[PDB]
Amino acid sequence: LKVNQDGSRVLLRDVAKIELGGENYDIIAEFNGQPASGLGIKLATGANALDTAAAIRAELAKMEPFFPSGLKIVYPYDTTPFVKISIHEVVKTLVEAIILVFLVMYLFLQNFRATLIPTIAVPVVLLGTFAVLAAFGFSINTLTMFGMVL
């Protein structure tokens, strides 16, 4: 910075404390009362939602193995498992609706052959809707899934 008359060297260390610190100290995170940081992924207007969160291999799994001693991943605030359960409960309803239909068909038609046509008539119709909605742009949405059930 300066060299005072008597040849005395003035350095930045003398007039100022220098440390490798954060660029911003306004925000600090604590995972269960333990010092931590992380990444809060925000969606893009019109993005593929679950497909973005499942756009993986990745989505940080190539960062997952190269961590030093101590550094570990953890998962709070997550959408993923809700989608995993929303489909599973709807598909379970689907199968339950077939089996319960199968009984009423047998309870009115004692012919085992007769209680088969309506049993094998409607599984085709569902896939048709899956094929038609895909050709129209519609996805396996919370609505379109209840639409199958309805």
């Binding site: 610190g21 911003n24 100290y25 306004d26």
Partner: protein, 150 residues
């Protein structure tokens, strides 16, 4: 929509190759239509004002919203918005020994907003009770204030 982008994003590579007087001026890329449709005249009857008082008020209450509203390529202003106008006197500059260079430098120092910090800043000492922002210099408001520039 895309034809606009291509010409405006190739322009912004010659932007730093232009004078800074032009850079701080209105560079505009818009959709062409050499024909008006709605030419809305704004006049005064009672509280008489000039063809400059209206021109400002139109451009400080309406013009900003119109060009934005419903895909309007560009809005034409018939006059001008108000500006802090200074009319320098050469004889009065000489009899005090001054130049327009000194005038510009005076405004570029006394008329400005300065980013001052805050008490209880980004990294505080654990135990502080107060957090308040600091106010420094502020852009001048009236003609009287501009008249009192040293």
């Amino acid at each position: 929509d895309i034809a606009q982008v291509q010409v405006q994003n190739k322009l912004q590579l010659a932007m730093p190759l232009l004078p800074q007087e032009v850079q701080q001026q209105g560079v505009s890329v818009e959709k062409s239509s050499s024909s008006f449709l709605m030419v809305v005249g704004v006049i005064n009857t009672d509280g008489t004002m000039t063809q400059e008082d209206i021109s400002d008020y139109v451009a400080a209450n309406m013009k900003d919203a119109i060009s934005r509203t419903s895909g309007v390529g560009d809005v034409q202003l018939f006059g001008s918005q108000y500006a802090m106008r200074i009319w320098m006197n050469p004889n009065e500059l000489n009899k005090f020994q001054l130049t327009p260079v000194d005038v510009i430098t005076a405004i570029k120092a006394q008329n400005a907003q300065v980013a001052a910090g805050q008490l209880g800043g980004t990294p505080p000492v654990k135990g502080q009770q107060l957090n308040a922002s600091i106010i420094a210099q502020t852009r001048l408001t009236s003609t009287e204030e501009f008249g009192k520039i040293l």
